[PDB]
Design a protein around this ligand. Structure first.
Ligand SMILES: [Cl-]
Length: 422
């Protein structure tokens, strides 16, 4: 019996930690973000996770004001105007209130926790009256009594409306710490390093995903590779296309950071640790932290049928409109050792079969469905909607493949579709 579907069930979240770096040098952070809403609408993302953007004098709790925007970025009025323009595109806005975000310990000192908590309660009220759709809180492993504070902040948020969302982020990849936070709260999303603490094999990927769902009784969750960092900084280069397919087709809300749709990478370890500039085009002004070529830029990837940006737009469109991906069940198939394969299914809608080859060579799928719920078995063939191999994509798209003899090319991911049979 299906719960009411809230705005975050309908597709991806998109994090913008450093508004000025996202926007560039031509405008101030809040106004400038407003001019990119049309680009963000083309990605079909359902929400933006912003900031933090508040006043925070490093490690000085009494020169930190969670209710005031940093004036370099804009005014309260600019913010309110941003929220209204986003709402005309059906894009919701989450605010990151991590308090000491400019210092080393982002939650101030342990001794200071009750002062933080008093400040935070006042801030949640003020921001919820200004029209935000919810809140994000990062590095929650550095927050004392995190489960208790998160529960309390959740209750204040939900008290106004169940359409308000809370997101927590951790540096941890440890399943037992992750489960402990989730048990303390209800319908909280928790982002983490869980999916990027990996050997990046077929078997390890299967094992990570199935153990997490089993440990949480398959409740609604987020899927991410970090609480903040870029996908191309956490995941091997050969797997960027494959991991995009995975995050879009697992059951739950996928969460990305700005630039993930391009394969952007962040600062190198000799450079200052600063968020990278979003490379709108190949102009010099965008060349921090690395020089960028046309093919690493929004302008370049926008007309390329082979680009990561083109695959993001395609998958995001399908995620927002097909019921089996909106809120379908998940079943893991058995497959050869280098593969992970699974299906998504709702009622009598089109089913989806995902097959992912984690090896640099041709592999037989050997798909098995030995244990499968009444109502669903595998067909003999299925239609190919998408391959990560853009060569095959230009000449086999919308064609049909026999499942029993399915073969994958090196590092290939497949999205296949099959119908309900009466
Ligand atoms: Cl943490």
């Amino acid at each position: 019996e299906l719960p009411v579907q809230r705005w975050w069930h309908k597709g991806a979240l998109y994090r913008i930690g450093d508004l000025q770096a996202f926007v560039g040098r031509d405008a101030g952070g809040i106004a400038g973000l407003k001019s990119h809403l049309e680009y963000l609408s083309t990605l079909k993302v359902k929400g933006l996770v912003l900031g933090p953007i508040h006043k925070n004098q490093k490690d000085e709790i009494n020169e930190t004001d969670l209710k005031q925007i940093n004036p370099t970025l804009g005014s309260q009025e600019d913010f309110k105007d941003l929220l209204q323009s986003a709402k005309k595109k059906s894009i919701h806005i989450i605010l990151d209130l991590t308090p000491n975000y400019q210092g080393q310990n982002a939650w101030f000192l342990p001794a200071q926790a009750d002062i933080v908590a008093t400040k935070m309660k006042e801030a949640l009220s003020s921001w919820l009256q200004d029209g935000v759709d919810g809140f994000q809180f990062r590095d929650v492993g550095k927050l004392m009594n995190a489960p208790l504070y998160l529960a309390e902040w959740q209750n204040i948020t939900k008290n106004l409306s169940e359409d308000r969302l809370l997101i927590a982020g951790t540096e941890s990849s440890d399943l037992q710490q992750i489960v402990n936070i989730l048990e303390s709260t209800s319908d909280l999303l928790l982002t983490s390093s869980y999916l990027s603490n990996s050997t990046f094999t077929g078997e390890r990927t299967e094992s990570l995903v199935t153990r997490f769902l089993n440990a949480t009784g398959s409740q609604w969750c987020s899927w991410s590779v970090s609480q903040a960092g870029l996908l191309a900084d956490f995941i091997p280069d050969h797997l960027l296309r494959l991991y995009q397919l995975l995050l879009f087709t697992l059951p739950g809300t996928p969460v990305f950071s700005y630039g993930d749709e391009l394969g952007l990478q962040g600062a190198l370890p000799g450079q200052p640790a600063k968020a990278p500039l979003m490379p709108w085009n190949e102009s010099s002004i965008f060349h921090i932290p690395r020089p960028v070529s046309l093919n690493m830029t929004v302008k370049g990837q926008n007309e390329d049928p082979g680009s990561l940006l083109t695959q993001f737009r395609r998958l995001s469109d399908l995620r927002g409109k097909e019921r089996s991906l909106l809120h379908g069940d998940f079943h893991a198939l058995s497959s050869s050792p280098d593969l992970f394969s699974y299906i998504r299914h709702w009622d009598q809608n089109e089913r989806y079969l995902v097959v992912l080859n984690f090896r640099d060579s041709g592999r037989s799928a050997r798909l098995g469905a030995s244990n499968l719920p009444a109502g669903i078995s595998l067909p003999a063939s299925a239609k190919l909607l998408l391959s990560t191999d853009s060569a095959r994509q230009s000449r086999e798209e919308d064609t049909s493949l026999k499942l029993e003899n399915l073969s994958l090319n090196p590092y290939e991911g497949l999205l296949l579709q099959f119908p309900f049979v009466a």
